[PDB]
Design an enzyme around this catalytic site. Structure first.
Site, PDB file in Angstrom:
ATOM      1  N   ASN A  72       0.777  -0.818   0.257  1.00 10.54           N
ATOM      2  CA  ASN A  72      -0.128  -0.210   0.187  1.00 10.54           C
ATOM      3  C   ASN A  72       0.580   1.041   0.040  1.00 10.54           C
ATOM      4  OD1 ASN A  72      -2.226  -1.276   0.688  1.00 10.54           O
ATOM      5  ND2 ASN A  72      -2.012  -1.764   2.482  1.00 10.54           N
ATOM      6  N   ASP A  89       0.305   3.754   1.714  1.00 12.63           N
ATOM      7  CA  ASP A  89       1.238   4.254   3.529  1.00 12.63           C
ATOM      8  C   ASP A  89       1.683   3.467   3.764  1.00 12.63           C
ATOM      9  OD1 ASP A  89      -0.008   1.944   3.452  1.00 12.63           O
ATOM     10  OD2 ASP A  89      -1.895   3.340   4.452  1.00 12.63           O
ATOM     11  N   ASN A 139      -4.834  -5.995   4.850  1.00 10.89           N
ATOM     12  CA  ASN A 139      -3.888  -5.403   5.388  1.00 10.89           C
ATOM     13  C   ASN A 139      -3.699  -5.452   6.552  1.00 10.89           C
ATOM     14  OD1 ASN A 139      -2.419  -2.370   5.056  1.00 10.89           O
ATOM     15  ND2 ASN A 139      -3.961  -2.026   4.540  1.00 10.89           N
ATOM     16  N   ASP A 162     -17.391  -5.113  11.807  1.00 12.51           N
ATOM     17  CA  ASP A 162     -16.158  -4.096  12.340  1.00 12.51           C
ATOM     18  C   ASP A 162     -17.587  -2.975  12.035  1.00 12.51           C
ATOM     19  OD1 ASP A 162     -15.361  -3.310  10.916  1.00 12.51           O
ATOM     20  OD2 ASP A 162     -13.738  -3.100  11.189  1.00 12.51           O
TER      21      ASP A 162
HETATM   22  C1  LIG Z   1     -10.198  -5.442   4.700  1.00 13.80           C
HETATM   23  C2  LIG Z   1      -8.370  -5.647   3.966  1.00 13.80           C
HETATM   24  O1  LIG Z   1      -7.809  -5.846   4.668  1.00 13.80           O
HETATM   25  N1  LIG Z   1      -8.827  -4.990   3.211  1.00 13.80           N
HETATM   26  C3  LIG Z   1      -7.706  -4.194   2.302  1.00 13.80           C
HETATM   27  C4  LIG Z   1      -7.164  -2.704   2.165  1.00 13.80           C
HETATM   28  O2  LIG Z   1      -6.726  -2.441   2.908  1.00 13.80           O
HETATM   29  C5  LIG Z   1      -7.251  -1.673   1.216  1.00 13.80           C
HETATM   30  O3  LIG Z   1      -8.105  -1.460   0.753  1.00 13.80           O
HETATM   31  C6  LIG Z   1      -6.894  -2.391  -0.372  1.00 13.80           C
HETATM   32  C7  LIG Z   1      -4.943  -2.439  -0.917  1.00 13.80           C
HETATM   33  O4  LIG Z   1      -5.650  -2.681  -2.308  1.00 13.80           O
HETATM   34  O5  LIG Z   1      -7.146  -4.169   0.132  1.00 13.80           O
HETATM   35  C8  LIG Z   1      -8.091  -5.169   0.624  1.00 13.80           C
HETATM   36  O6  LIG Z   1      -9.405  -4.544   0.327  1.00 13.80           O
END
Ligand SMILES: CC(=O)N[C@@H]1[C@@H](O)[C@H](O)[C@@H](CO)O[C@@H]1O
Ligand SMILES: [Cl-]
Ligand SMILES: [Cl-]
Ligand SMILES: [Cl-]
Ligand SMILES: [Cl-]
Ligand code: NA
Length: 129
Positions: free
Chosen positions: A46, A48, A59, A101
């Site tokens: 990601n 960040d 994530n 959640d």
């Molecule tokens: C539930 C979860 O971890 N979702 C993740 C989210 O963090 C993010 O927007 C994305 C990144 O590519 O992938 C997944 O959807």
């Protein structure tokens, strides 16, 4: 491990993902298809600095610990490498907490943009369940 479409659906059904919090089994198979292409070893970085892991691209910024996402949470109390196992038990149990959640399956961006509002049952059609 690269799951088959029906192979993953049965493994998800055995772990109690069918109709979990109102989301039929087609939603989880569709999400895993567009998040990881049924690949348990799928990882993505990601912007960040956090990383998504596993069949459902969970994530590390909130749910798992990978040792290099500073200031993040480990809400599922697992190493992120446990999400890359061929056993989807860790990814399923963590997904049950994520979907509970408040936001539901909207936490998965791929499900919101590519599965929500579609005929998700077609992802389990023809499968021995
Ligand atoms: C539930 C979860 O971890 N979702 C993740 C989210 O963090 C993010 O927007 C994305 C990144 O590519 O992938 C997944 O959807
Ligand atoms: Cl379904
Ligand atoms: Cl960390
Ligand atoms: Cl499994
Ligand atoms: Cl919901
Ligand atoms: Na973390």
């Amino acid at each position: 491990k690269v799951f088959g479409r029906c192979e993953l659906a049965a493994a998800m059904k055995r772990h109690g993902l069918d109709n979990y919090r109102g989301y039929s089994l087609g939603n989880w198979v569709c999400a895993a298809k567009f998040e990881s292409n049924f690949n348990t070893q799928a990882t993505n970085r990601n912007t960040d600095g956090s990383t998504d892991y596993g069949i459902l691209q969970i994530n590390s910024r909130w749910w798992c610990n990978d040792g290099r996402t500073p200031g993040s949470r480990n809400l599922c109390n697992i190493p992120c490498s446990a999400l890359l196992s061929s056993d989807i038990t860790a990814s399923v149990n963590c997904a049950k907490k994520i979907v509970s959640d408040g936001n539901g399956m909207n936490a998965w961006v791929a499900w919101r943009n590519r599965c929500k509002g579609t005929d998700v049952q077609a992802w389990i059609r023809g499968c021995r369940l």
